[PDB]
Design an enzyme around this catalytic site. Structure first.
Site, PDB file in Angstrom:
ATOM      1  N   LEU A   2      21.510   7.376  86.883  1.00 27.33           N
ATOM      2  CA  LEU A   2      21.385   8.721  86.464  1.00 27.33           C
ATOM      3  C   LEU A   2      21.791   9.071  85.448  1.00 27.33           C
ATOM      4  O   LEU A   2      20.781  10.481  84.812  1.00 27.33           O
ATOM      5  CB  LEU A   2      22.826   9.346  87.031  1.00 27.33           C
ATOM      6  CG  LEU A   2      22.305   9.227  89.354  1.00 27.33           C
ATOM      7  CD1 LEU A   2      23.704   9.808  90.047  1.00 27.33           C
ATOM      8  CD2 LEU A   2      21.217  10.257  89.612  1.00 27.33           C
ATOM      9  N   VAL A  55      24.342   8.407  81.531  1.00 27.10           N
ATOM     10  CA  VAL A  55      25.125   8.001  80.703  1.00 27.10           C
ATOM     11  C   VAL A  55      26.386   8.096  81.048  1.00 27.10           C
ATOM     12  O   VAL A  55      27.578   6.714  80.390  1.00 27.10           O
ATOM     13  CB  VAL A  55      24.859   7.546  78.891  1.00 27.10           C
ATOM     14  CG1 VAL A  55      23.860   7.315  78.601  1.00 27.10           C
ATOM     15  CG2 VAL A  55      24.848   9.149  78.957  1.00 27.10           C
ATOM     16  N   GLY A  56      26.566   9.385  80.682  1.00 27.29           N
ATOM     17  CA  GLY A  56      28.236   9.276  81.135  1.00 27.29           C
ATOM     18  C   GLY A  56      29.262   9.483  80.209  1.00 27.29           C
ATOM     19  O   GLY A  56      29.156   9.776  78.634  1.00 27.29           O
ATOM     20  N   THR A  57      30.892   9.694  80.083  1.00 31.49           N
ATOM     21  CA  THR A  57      31.739   9.652  78.979  1.00 31.49           C
ATOM     22  C   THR A  57      31.745   8.151  78.691  1.00 31.49           C
ATOM     23  O   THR A  57      31.893   7.415  77.419  1.00 31.49           O
ATOM     24  CB  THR A  57      32.792  10.585  79.547  1.00 31.49           C
ATOM     25  OG1 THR A  57      32.517  11.633  79.923  1.00 31.49           O
ATOM     26  CG2 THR A  57      33.954  11.041  78.327  1.00 31.49           C
ATOM     27  N   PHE A  58      32.814   7.704  80.063  1.00 29.07           N
ATOM     28  CA  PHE A  58      33.356   6.127  79.376  1.00 29.07           C
ATOM     29  C   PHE A  58      32.170   5.812  80.073  1.00 29.07           C
ATOM     30  O   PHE A  58      31.984   4.157  79.240  1.00 29.07           O
ATOM     31  CB  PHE A  58      34.164   6.340  80.482  1.00 29.07           C
ATOM     32  CG  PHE A  58      35.256   7.268  80.031  1.00 29.07           C
ATOM     33  CD1 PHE A  58      36.489   6.947  79.532  1.00 29.07           C
ATOM     34  CD2 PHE A  58      35.867   7.991  81.322  1.00 29.07           C
ATOM     35  CE1 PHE A  58      37.062   7.702  78.827  1.00 29.07           C
ATOM     36  CE2 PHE A  58      36.572   9.742  80.668  1.00 29.07           C
ATOM     37  CZ  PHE A  58      38.075   9.391  80.234  1.00 29.07           C
ATOM     38  N   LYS A 110      27.983   4.306  82.559  1.00 29.60           N
ATOM     39  CA  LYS A 110      27.350   5.487  82.738  1.00 29.60           C
ATOM     40  C   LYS A 110      27.192   5.610  84.556  1.00 29.60           C
ATOM     41  O   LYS A 110      28.091   5.168  85.056  1.00 29.60           O
ATOM     42  CB  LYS A 110      26.147   4.314  83.039  1.00 29.60           C
ATOM     43  CG  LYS A 110      25.779   2.879  83.589  1.00 29.60           C
ATOM     44  CD  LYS A 110      25.026   2.388  82.952  1.00 29.60           C
ATOM     45  CE  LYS A 110      25.130   1.443  81.830  1.00 29.60           C
ATOM     46  NZ  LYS A 110      23.747   0.115  81.207  1.00 29.60           N
ATOM     47  N   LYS A 130      30.526   6.067  89.337  1.00 26.12           N
ATOM     48  CA  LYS A 130      30.430   5.980  87.959  1.00 26.12           C
ATOM     49  C   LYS A 130      31.097   5.054  87.827  1.00 26.12           C
ATOM     50  O   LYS A 130      32.319   4.500  88.567  1.00 26.12           O
ATOM     51  CB  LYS A 130      31.915   7.376  88.414  1.00 26.12           C
ATOM     52  CG  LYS A 130      31.924   7.625  86.498  1.00 26.12           C
ATOM     53  CD  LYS A 130      33.060   8.140  85.551  1.00 26.12           C
ATOM     54  CE  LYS A 130      32.952   8.851  84.444  1.00 26.12           C
ATOM     55  NZ  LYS A 130      34.155   9.600  83.712  1.00 26.12           N
ATOM     56  N   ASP A 144      35.441  19.899  78.787  1.00 25.24           N
ATOM     57  CA  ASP A 144      34.023  20.177  78.555  1.00 25.24           C
ATOM     58  C   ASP A 144      33.004  21.163  79.550  1.00 25.24           C
ATOM     59  O   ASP A 144      32.471  19.974  80.549  1.00 25.24           O
ATOM     60  CB  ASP A 144      33.312  18.526  78.402  1.00 25.24           C
ATOM     61  CG  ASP A 144      31.794  18.966  78.183  1.00 25.24           C
ATOM     62  OD1 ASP A 144      31.924  19.350  77.133  1.00 25.24           O
ATOM     63  OD2 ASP A 144      31.768  17.420  78.249  1.00 25.24           O
TER      64      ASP A 144
END
Ligand SMILES: OC[C@H]1O[C@@H]2O[C@H]3[C@H](O)[C@@H](O)[C@@H](O[C@H]4[C@H](O)[C@@H](O)[C@@H](O[C@H]5[C@H](O)[C@@H](O)[C@@H](O[C@H]6[C@H](O)[C@@H](O)[C@@H](O[C@H]7[C@H](O)[C@@H](O)[C@@H](O[C@H]8[C@H](O)[C@@H](O)[C@@H](O[C@H]1[C@H](O)[C@H]2O)O[C@@H]8CO)O[C@@H]7CO)O[C@@H]6CO)O[C@@H]5CO)O[C@@H]4CO)O[C@@H]3CO
Ligand SMILES: Nc1ncnc2c1ncn2[C@@H]1O[C@H](COP(=O)(O)O)[C@@H](O)[C@H]1O
Ligand SMILES: Nc1ncnc2c1ncn2[C@@H]1O[C@H](COP(=O)(O)O)[C@@H](O)[C@H]1O
Ligand SMILES: Nc1ncnc2c1ncn2[C@@H]1O[C@H](COP(=O)(O)O)[C@@H](O)[C@H]1O
Lengths: 459, 300, 181
Positions: A14, A16-19, A21, A37, A131
């Site tokens: 889906l 890359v995300g924060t921490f 993928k 996640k 954010d």
């Protein structure tokens, strides 16, 4: 072979995300879709963000909202952490904005209501989402709103501000870009304001290639307001995007605005019934056992004569009548060509004697001397009393005393601020015991503790 | 009769009575009495919990009655002295007040039912009941007869109310119609205080030659003396004392004997006063129905 | 079953061990920084080593031991009991550890200047004038940020005056106190 969690097998990626993928899960049997996640142990171990991830899951766990991505469960192993979530087809809103160009009033109004109900839910639960951006809000198959990322979020503590400045470069509030302390509702509201702008103009209100010029563009309350839309929205956006956080709109102020009211479903803010459970759920602690799992069936079957149901429904009616004649529970602000004000019978003598003077409360103890010099001068007095202290940061102390009459102990915190270049201010803050009668007041003990300290600093 | 109104109070805590946001002031026993009374008018509050620094607990309560007692107790004349109370202190006055009798502080937990509160008001004969959280020991709010009645009618459903409310006050026999404690329009404010100490009454409706109510002097009204710094001269009439608000109040809120209880309670909470003086065509005094009467007529 | 990662670069990578026949090769799958695969392994300890670019090598990131042959292999304990959530993480104040109660003297190393006072605390709730019609004892709903903070009134008398807005379960109260010097 292929990675899988429980009965869910991991598919296509889906994002890359924060921490770490995120991919799609698929149930081996039924074929349900869930977003996972994946936070790799090796990666999260490196940084001390173990608390950053802890707080996130802690908050998202007990969160149920149609527009907040609902966290189903979190499975973890020595290899990596997993968080399964509700998967949605539409994708991020920024994909929907760009692909669809600019959104009209009938549409934009719809989505903004959904997102604002999301952040309202968050603010009422004492958790802020720093954010905020169309790239962070998803859409289901019905093209509704879903708030996704909570990794940059935080929890709101009583009598506490937030130092950390987080989020996108354009969406960051004018106070957080400068690196100033904030409460946390106002910073999301400002991020909401620019989202509302992007939902209309199709472009960002504050945008530049070179920075801080963008931040200087943000610090200034100047932004392009095309004739594209009516002034009602402009008055909203201006009040919502106000540079001064004290003059900024609250979640309530947006609810009371005109353009916002128009064609607004009542399932967002919990007064009327639900369309597509609320805070009134917390009556159980007094009456009976937890009940969250047990009496769902007692209210799902529409049975209102159950002993648990007859204790639930009447609570929502109680809160509705509290708003009726709300002058009983909360005080009202002062009152065009409108005069009549019939004073409360116990308010009659004072206004008359005034028109047939001076009462002003200071913030705290104020003195103008050097920042390291003052705390040292205070650190003398704090000792002198026989009370004790531990220091956290050079200007922040955590202090406590032992009660003379009982073995009880009360504490407090002293955070020094800078009101201006010429003067500093010392703050005094109470605290609380950790999560049978008592012959002493925790509230008074705090005052006496400060009072003793203040007496030495003054004389 | 007790089927609904009595059950309602037992089914709700005092917690619900507490406002969402409110103000409270407290006085240390070491504080002077003069300063304490001036602090009351600047804050608007008519009651403050007494805290003792040595005992490290709330010892008692301070209302306007204390300002009345001390005003009638230590007084010589409007000109000559003023001496006794000015150098006096709360703990010192408490000493001479408890010289006659010893009564400790009464308070109720917010977790206790509304029925337990109204009981404590009648049982101890007290207007101000401070609610204090036993776990924290903090005084949250001060319960009042006014607060309960307003809460009662506002939150009670319409199905329970119609039982004995439809009957006339005269026929219900609620309130004291025997000895009506009053004052004249020319009677000094001191003798009015003298009646306030002799009886437990919360107000003295003033009357003319005919015996008709032209005004009312509440125990709350005496704090104005402190507010205006006129407490020195107690020789003035109650009319002269009430002359401060004379251009502001509408009139005297009152009712009739033949009127229904339903109409009384509604007018009483809407006016936000503590009592009504029942009268006739001539507007002469008949009796007085205080919140205490309504509240005490409910519990049993 | 269990999974393993490989953080070092390589062209062709395989994984072996004692579970599978001591000579067995399991094709690994690729990612940007890692190379992984999955197998069903029986309860117990294990000895494994990676085969990369033709050479047998071990991963320094994982634990290591010496086998009976004298080679260098790693150690893993496979179990089915780890679903953990809070064990993986392994006052209640903002989580940055440092020292303890009852002692201190002088300045820290850091030269950071003190933070600027937030505009929130400067807004006072007692100085605000309420409506004339409402009860005198009432006050507006305070902001959660300014609750615990003390508000002292300038001492223009021989008695100290200071208040704070403390919150209760669903309610808020501002408690004022007059205490002689
Ligand atoms: O082939 C199985 C084996 O493959 C992998 O090993 C690789 C290794 O990781 C690399 O380092 C390299 O090995 C080279 C090595 O570094 C050099 O030192 C040299 O090897 C010499 C040895 O030093 C020397 O000891 C001798 O070995 C003798 C032993 O002393 C003796 O005990 C006997 O060994 C028998 C064992 O007793 C018994 O337990 C059983 O051994 C098994 C292991 O327990 C098991 O771990 C596994 O070994 C893997 C290994 O895990 C991988 O990392 O399987 C073994 C089964 O065979 O059986 C043993 C024999 O029956 O054997 C000799 C007696 O003379 O040998 C040499 C002396 O020159 O050269 C190495 C390069 O080839 O590469 C290897 C892979 O090629
Ligand atoms: N809750 C209380 N606890 C102790 N004494 C009280 C209390 N309430 C009132 N009093 C006393 O009664 C007087 C005030 O009565 P009232 O104005 O009717 O509430 C004061 O002199 C107090 O000492
Ligand atoms: N002026 C008065 N004279 C005599 N009794 C009164 C008077 N006012 C009220 N009462 C009675 O006293 C009770 C109320 O007391 P309080 O709440 O202090 O005014 C009721 O039972 C009334 O009937
Ligand atoms: N029955 C009444 N009619 C008119 N004013 C009243 C009446 N009762 C009380 N008040 C006024 O309300 C104040 C006292 O209120 P309370 O202490 O609640 O009785 C005083 O200023 C009185 O003038």
């Amino acid at each position: 072979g292929s990675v899988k969690i429980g009965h869910y097998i991991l598919g296509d990626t889906l994002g890359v995300g924060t921490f770490g993928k995120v991919k799609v899960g698929k149930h081996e049997l039924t074929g349900h879709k869930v977003a996972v996640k994946i936070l790799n142990r090796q990666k999260i171990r490196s940084l001390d963000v173990v608390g950053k991830i802890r707080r996130e899951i802690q908050n998202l766990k007990l969160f149920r909202h149609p527009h907040i991505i609902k966290l189903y469960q979190v499975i973890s192993t020595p290899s990596d952490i997993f968080m399964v979530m509700e998967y949605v087809s539409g994708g991020e809103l920024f994909d929907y904005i760009c692909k669809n160009g600019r959104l009209d009033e009938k549409e934009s109004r719809r989505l903004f209501q959904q997102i604002l109900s999301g952040v309202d839910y968050c603010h009422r639960h004492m958790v802020v989402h720093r954010d905020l951006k169309p790239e962070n809000v998803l859409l289901d198959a019905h093209m509704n709103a879903k708030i996704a990322d909570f990794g940059l979020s935080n929890m709101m503590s009583d009598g506490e501000f937030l130092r950390t400045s987080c989020g996108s470069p354009n969406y960051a509030a004018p106070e957080v870009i400068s690196g100033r302390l904030y409460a946390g509702p106002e910073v999301d509201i400002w991020s909401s304001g620019v989202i509302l702008y992007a939902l209309l103009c199709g472009t960002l209100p504050f945008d530049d290639d070179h920075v801080p010029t963008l931040f200087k563009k943000i610090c200034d309350g100047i932004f392009y307001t095309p004739q594209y839309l009516n002034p009602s929205v402009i008055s909203l956006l201006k009040h919502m995007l106000q540079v001064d956080p004290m003059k900024r709109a609250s979640i309530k102020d947006i609810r009371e605005h005109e353009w916002f009211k128009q064609d607004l479903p009542k399932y967002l803010f919990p007064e009327d019934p639900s369309y597509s459970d609320d805070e009134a759920l917390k009556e159980v602690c007094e009456k009976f056992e937890c009940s969250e799992e047990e009496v769902l069936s007692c209210l799902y079957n529409r049975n209102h004569q159950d002993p648990l149901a007859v204790a639930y429904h009447l609570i929502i009616d109680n809160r509705r009548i509290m708003n009726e004649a709300k002058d009983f529970y909360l005080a009202t602000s002062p009152p065009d060509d409108h005069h009549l004000t019939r004073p409360h019978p116990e308010r009659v003598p004072f206004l008359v004697a005034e028109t047939p003077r001076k009462a002003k409360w200071h913030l705290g103890i104020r003195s103008q001397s050097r920042p390291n010099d003052i705390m040292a001068e205070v650190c003398r007095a704090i000792k002198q009393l026989d009370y004790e202290w531990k220091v956290v940061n050079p200007y922040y102390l955590r202090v406590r005393r032992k009660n003379p009459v009982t073995s009880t102990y009360s504490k407090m915190s002293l955070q020094l601020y800078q009101v201006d270049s010429r003067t500093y201010l010392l703050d005094f803050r109470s605290i609380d015991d950790g999560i049978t009668p008592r012959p002493g007041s925790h509230t008074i003990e705090f005052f006496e503790m400060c009072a003793n300290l203040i007496k030495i600093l003054a004389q | 009769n007790n089927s609904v109104y009595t059950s309602f109070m037992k089914s709700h805590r005092c917690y619900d009575l507490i406002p969402t946001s409110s103000k409270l002031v407290v006085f240390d026993t070491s504080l002077q009495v003069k300063k304490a009374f001036f602090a009351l008018v600047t804050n608007g509050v008519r009651a403050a919990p007494l805290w003792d620094s040595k005992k490290q607990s709330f010892v008692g309560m301070l209302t306007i009655t204390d300002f009345i007692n001390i005003l009638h107790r230590y007084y010589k004349s409007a000109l000559v002295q003023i001496y006794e109370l000015e150098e006096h202190k709360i703990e010192t006055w408490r000493e001479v007040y408890l010289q006659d009798s010893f009564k400790p502080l009464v308070c109720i937990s917010p977790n206790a039912s509304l029925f337990d509160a109204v009981s404590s008001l009648i049982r101890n004969k007290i207007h101000r009941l401070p609610v204090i959280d036993p776990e924290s020991g903090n005084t949250l709010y001060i319960l009042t007869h006014k607060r309960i009645l307003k809460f009662l009618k506002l939150f009670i459903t319409e199905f329970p109310k119609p039982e004995f409310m439809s009957k006339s006050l005269e026929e219900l026999q609620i309130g004291t119609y025997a000895n009506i404690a009053m004052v004249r329009t020319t009677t000094p404010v001191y003798v009015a205080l003298g009646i306030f100490v002799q009886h437990r009454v919360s107000a003295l409706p003033v009357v003319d030659e005919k015996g008709r109510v032209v005004d009312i002097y509440s125990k709350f009204d005496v704090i104005n003396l402190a507010a205006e710094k006129t407490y020195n001269n107690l020789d003035v009439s109650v009319t002269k004392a009430l002359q401060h608000r004379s251009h502001y109040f509408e009139g005297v809120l009152k009712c009739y004997l033949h009127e229904t209880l339903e109409t009384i309670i509604n007018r009483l909470v809407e006016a936000e006063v503590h009592r009504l003086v029942v009268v006739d065509e001539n507007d002469v005094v008949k009796g007085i129905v205080s919140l205490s009467d309504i509240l005490q007529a409910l519990v049993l | 079953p269990t999974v393993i990662r490989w953080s070092e670069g390589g062209k062709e990578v395989f994984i072996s061990g004692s579970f599978n026949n001591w000579s067995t090769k399991i094709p690994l799958i690729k990612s940007h920084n890692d190379f992984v695969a999955i197998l069903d392994l029986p309860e117990g300890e294990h000895q494994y080593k990676f085969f990369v670019d033709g050479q047998w090598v071990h991963d320094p990131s994982e634990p290591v031991v010496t086998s009976q042959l004298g080679t260098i292999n790693n150690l893993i304990h496979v179990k089915k009991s780890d679903f953990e959530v809070f064990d993986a993480l392994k006052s209640s104040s903002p989580p940055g550890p440092y020292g303890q109660e009852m002692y201190a003297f002088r300045s820290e190393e850091r030269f950071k200047s003190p933070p600027i006072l937030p505009p929130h605390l400067l807004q006072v709730i007692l100085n605000k004038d309420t409506n004339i019609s409402c009860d005198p004892a009432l006050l507006p709903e305070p902001n959660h940020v300014m609750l615990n903070h003390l508000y002292a009134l300038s001492i223009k008398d021989s008695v100290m005056v200071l208040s704070a807005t403390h919150r209760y379960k669903k309610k808020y109260v501002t408690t004022l106190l007059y205490k002689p010097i």
